[PDB]
Amino acid sequence: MTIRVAINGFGRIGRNFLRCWFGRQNTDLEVVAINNTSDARTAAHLLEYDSVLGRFNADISYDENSITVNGKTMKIVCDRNPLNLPWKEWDIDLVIESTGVFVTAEGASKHIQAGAKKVLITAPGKGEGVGTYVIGVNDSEYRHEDFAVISNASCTTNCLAPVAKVLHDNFGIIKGTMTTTHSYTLDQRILDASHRDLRRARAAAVNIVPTTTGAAKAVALVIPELKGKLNGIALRVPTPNVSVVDLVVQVEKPTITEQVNEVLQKASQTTMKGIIKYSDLPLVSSDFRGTDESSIVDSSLTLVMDGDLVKVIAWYDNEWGYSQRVVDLAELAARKWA
Amino acid sequence: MTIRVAINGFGRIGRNFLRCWFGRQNTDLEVVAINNTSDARTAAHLLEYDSVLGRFNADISYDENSITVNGKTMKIVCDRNPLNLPWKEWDIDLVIESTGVFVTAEGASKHIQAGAKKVLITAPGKGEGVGTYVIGVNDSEYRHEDFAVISNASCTTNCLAPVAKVLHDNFGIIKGTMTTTHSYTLDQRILDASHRDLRRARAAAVNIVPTTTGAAKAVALVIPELKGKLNGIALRVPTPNVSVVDLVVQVEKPTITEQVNEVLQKASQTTMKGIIKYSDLPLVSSDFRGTDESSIVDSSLTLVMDGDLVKVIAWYDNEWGYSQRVVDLAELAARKWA
Amino acid sequence: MTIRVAINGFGRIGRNFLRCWFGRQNTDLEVVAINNTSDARTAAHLLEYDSVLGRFNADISYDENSITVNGKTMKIVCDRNPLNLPWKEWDIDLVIESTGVFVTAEGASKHIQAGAKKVLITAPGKGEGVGTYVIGVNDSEYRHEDFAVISNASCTTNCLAPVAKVLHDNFGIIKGTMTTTHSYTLDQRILDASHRDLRRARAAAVNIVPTTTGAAKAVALVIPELKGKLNGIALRVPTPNVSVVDLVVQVEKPTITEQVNEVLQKASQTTMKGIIKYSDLPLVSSDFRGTDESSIVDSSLTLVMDGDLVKVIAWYDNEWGYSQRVVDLAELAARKWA
Amino acid sequence: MTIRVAINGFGRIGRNFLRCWFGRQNTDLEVVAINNTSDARTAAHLLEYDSVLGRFNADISYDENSITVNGKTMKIVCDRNPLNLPWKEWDIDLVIESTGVFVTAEGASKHIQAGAKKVLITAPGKGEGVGTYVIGVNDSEYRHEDFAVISNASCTTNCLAPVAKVLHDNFGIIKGTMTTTHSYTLDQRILDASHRDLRRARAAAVNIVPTTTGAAKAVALVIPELKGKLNGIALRVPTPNVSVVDLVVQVEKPTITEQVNEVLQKASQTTMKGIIKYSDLPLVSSDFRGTDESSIVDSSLTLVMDGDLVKVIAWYDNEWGYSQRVVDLAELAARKWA
Ligand SMILES: NC(=O)c1ccc[n+]([C@@H]2O[C@H](COP(=O)([O-])OP(=O)(O)OC[C@H]3O[C@@H](n4cnc5c(N)ncnc54)[C@H](O)[C@@H]3O)[C@@H](O)[C@H]2O)c1
Ligand SMILES: NC(=O)c1ccc[n+]([C@@H]2O[C@H](COP(=O)([O-])OP(=O)(O)OC[C@H]3O[C@@H](n4cnc5c(N)ncnc54)[C@H](O)[C@@H]3O)[C@@H](O)[C@H]2O)c1
Ligand SMILES: NC(=O)c1ccc[n+]([C@@H]2O[C@H](COP(=O)([O-])OP(=O)(O)OC[C@H]3O[C@@H](n4cnc5c(N)ncnc54)[C@H](O)[C@@H]3O)[C@@H](O)[C@H]2O)c1
Ligand SMILES: NC(=O)c1ccc[n+]([C@@H]2O[C@H](COP(=O)([O-])OP(=O)(O)OC[C@H]3O[C@@H](n4cnc5c(N)ncnc54)[C@H](O)[C@@H]3O)[C@@H](O)[C@H]2O)c1
């Protein structure tokens, strides 16, 4: 039956996930609690009024201890430390980890000590003992008992992995390389300020800033055949949302642009319905705000050099599209709860 | 004497201050130490490379706990707790407090408890007990013994006060209002994220964002005759540096556009040289990047409606100009030192 | 009965007007033709996909000579010269002038020679013989026979005029002054390039650029009692949409903040329903995208100095809100057609 | 000889060219006239004040039909039709064509018909019959008599060619792909507005915008061995200056990251001094503002996947660096002049 759910850290991903879930047709989820480093006041307001999502059209209320949306009432808490959270008493089955701060098996597992059964990191996990899934790529390989702490990977990996999969299943990937042109995030600085990354230290809205990305390697986690076959880098540009992957692969079967486009389109219609969108129209970044899929292939941008060096460009709503997938993963965890 | 100076917090203001100070002709200041949350490497890199100021043209080098600029070595410490600092042992006369977090008389006097004799908050003072000075406005009221904790006020006030002084001295301000169209700062949030000001909580580079400002009440600290006579609001817009003040005052002696521009000009050549720049060219914000002055009167924007309702638009480089003034205020304390 | 309508110049205003009209509950208008300096291809695509409005959710088709939206078929033409347009044969009653280029009584009147009965400039008119209306302020004063060429003023004047009216009717305006902080427009340059205005010549997205505005004077056109009582200036900032008016007036009846807020709210509920919105929530510029009203008063920003110097700040969607008014004016022209 | 030069079109490239030329050590060029759509006033103002370059530090003065810089007077004309120009009577050897509209052999030869002996398009050549040179790449193939109309190619090609040359000379390029993340330019539209490229039709400072580029085919004009071996796409992002090229080539001799960085470095010290800058610091885009070089290799971004799939990231100041190269190309034509 249904599983009870709480959110941890009500930021971009956290509020996106909610609105994604509130838009859902059907569900096996019951959101019931939210924990964030701010009062309920600042919660129910960043929810309704979003610089990027536009205004959430829904009945929204709040008091000191709760917030409420379209009938449904949640519960608000405020513990910087998950070990202190009322998950046992509140019979919390799954916690969505969206603080960005508890991404190790241990930290994410503090929610387990506190009474929760399973935790879903909305971000790559670090260290050992987290199970990583990307919907459309990996999720047939899901067993409730494998991991109490799971990861939905990164927004970038979710864009990249489904395209890698299709390209691989159809032409065989030998090796390749990838660049992501990414809208800045909160991990960057609006002005030159201290950061562990001497580049992310620098004013985000007036720079192209190069940075590292684990995403090309991460595909290995969900497509182990591509282990050591992909590298990459990211470039932060001053957009606030939507991002793009530029993937170049040496492929085993010689092909043409029309054909790799054909197979990507096929997938968008079939094995990848809902995950890959196929765009043949001459569009730009803002046109994909609020798109549900995880990779949006720009077919007119696909390229093939001498039969076997292919390039495809895929867009993604790095916040919203990713949040539809974390929803999906949660629904899957629900349906498969052993 | 020649006084020994420590910089607490090596951010925008902190680094501008060092850059301004190295480019000075003569000085009664010796900068001996710097405390900042990062390491000496991160500090020297952020010092040499600046997105707004461009490259620092100097000989810069660093080891594990010092940076050296043009022969002058300065010790680096990393201590979030000002009570810990070895100011007594390093014979520190003046601490420049530019962390933005010790802005009360008590917070900032942590530096005095640790051995310093005077501290200069590079921001307005919070609460009672700090002494505030705006070079060109009330610096003649500076007395060594008055306060252990002193303030250079805000960039906005430093832009407002000089213009207000000249306007009031020549026509008599009765009451007035001001709006500041301000580049975003590090106190503003990168993307939609929590903040005590729900408006400051929103993505700074995609929003015009209204916030309160103390700047207009503050001018009374330095021009007491204006007490109770000015209020203002601020609107944060997506540029990374240089702001503008839009001042509307009702005035005692009726006047004309030609005449107020005339007095503002006269001032810029005499009583306010170096403090008020007088610009009669059709310029825009970026042209004032690097301007040493505090206020830059845009002369062709001056309006006088029906004799006694005057509007003056004045730009300011909100980091660089302001930082030249903190230098000035530090030099001043040095010369009046007892 | 209904009047037949054509649009001239399918840019921001032109496409906004259409979508506004397509969202309308009821109507006395029948759009039937569109004339723009580009094929129908580029027309039906800039319509559906908008960087600012988001995607137009509606059934949209096009061939070489037409475009079609939700059943309704229009007709596409392409004459840089209105004298060549098929208005006579197409029995065109009203033309919406949105090219920005035919804003004199003569030029706008070329549409008359070509067979149209009335023309509505979506912009201030210049020279003599255009009748200017701002809904909520002036429109009771509308007579079909006064002008064959009418003007809906500017987006800025529409924000300013209703607030001036209410403030005047309640407290008596003596004189005042206004600044608009405006999202850049197509009349600006993305980079430093030649322009009749030496300031609008300069890179719009990385400058605060001062420019002139006729808006404060224009209020005189629709509130002749305020003739010579208002001046102002504009400041272009790098946002793409939403703008703000900052209005400061010396008022005759001494009042308080609560009260001027009270009267503005009253108006938003009554004589100004649909034109003035009253916002008491702590919001930012992006939150008013797609708002229908012409002035959005930010009550928490209202100020009163010594009883009789009042400041109110009003937001506006400079494209969308203005386009709801041009629709309104057109509906009025229809209903009053003598 | 020492040659007489006219500048047709005083825009970004036009003005950079003059600024670059005045800051040159020695010159075989004499600039005698300038043709631009505006007046002499607008030209001198745009020359002194530049949003990207900041203030031109020179003695600048102007009358109705001349500007004077550091003693050197240059005549101003305003003639949209190159056939009209008095190049024969002013004994004009070399016309710098930087209007962006006479880019075919025939369009540009209008200047030859009007009396000039050679024209240099500051952009790629459209169609057959123009000669193309990239300083540092094939300038040794420059022969006075080969073409009346010559080209400096695009900023992107000027960044790509040098890197391509060194990569190919040392490892042997087989085939490859490139993407250019480019600051927006004046060919890009301010807000959503009509254009032949529906993607270039969209607001440049709020969109990542994909457009085609000839840059990768073009490198073959200057490195013929690369004919048919490179393709590319461009992505326009919201910065006003400095771009970056992301180059992926499959290579004949297997190699390692250390070694390609080694050869790129060696080059930057020897065979490509002044053309390729070698940056091993963790920098960002703004740090390359004002860089004289053509390509700036970001050494820590270099990737080599599995021996023969190399990626190099290289920045360029797309206006300033490129304009130093048009100077170079003009000096070159001057020295080889017959
Ligand atoms: N932004 C994207 O596009 C994107 C895409 C994929 C994954 N992610 C990942 O999602 C995670 C969240 O990133 P974000 O972009 O939403 O930034 P965010 O600022 O929105 O972080 C979300 C929230 O966590 C809250 N929080 C912090 N510490 C907390 C604590 N101790 N207890 C409870 N709440 C706490 C913060 O106050 C914030 O509201 C990150 O790990 C990021 O890597 C982000
Ligand atoms: N930016 C402007 O235009 C402007 C103008 C005038 C005044 N100010 C004032 O300058 C002050 C600094 O603002 P900023 O713009 O320079 O932001 P900032 O970049 O300087 O951030 C402040 C610095 O202090 C450091 N720091 C934080 N906590 C510390 C601690 N406990 N101990 C030691 N160091 C610590 C931070 O790591 C950073 O280096 C603020 O109070 C602001 O109001 C700013
Ligand atoms: N942008 C605003 O916020 C705003 C607000 C109020 C009023 N206005 C006014 O609206 C008018 C249009 O401005 P805009 O912002 O929509 O710019 P715009 O670029 O969208 O101009 C609209 C269209 O007119 C077309 N056009 C040009 N010449 C033509 C011709 N000879 N025949 C037919 N079509 C032609 C252009 O191709 C463009 O598509 C201007 O006069 C402006 O002052 C604009
Ligand atoms: N911006 C870059 O990074 C870059 C780099 C390399 C090459 N280019 C090339 O430089 C050329 C100019 O582009 P830009 O960026 O300098 O835009 P721009 O600012 O220079 O606009 C071009 C100039 O030419 C003038 N002009 C237009 N028509 C004219 C005519 N008929 N006669 C005389 N003058 C006329 C315009 O008024 C303006 O002064 C383009 O062809 C572009 O492809 C640009």
Coordinates of C-alpha atoms in Angstrom, one line a residue, chain D residues 103-106 121 124-130:
Chain D
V103 CA 31.1 40.1 -46.7
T104 CA 31.0 38.7 -50.3
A105 CA 33.8 39.3 -52.8
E106 CA 31.4 41.5 -54.7
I121 CA 36.6 41.9 -44.2
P124 CA 34.4 35.3 -42.6
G125 CA 34.0 35.7 -46.4
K126 CA 30.6 34.8 -47.9
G127 CA 30.9 32.8 -51.2
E128 CA 33.9 32.3 -53.5
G129 CA 36.8 34.7 -54.1
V130 CA 38.0 36.1 -50.8

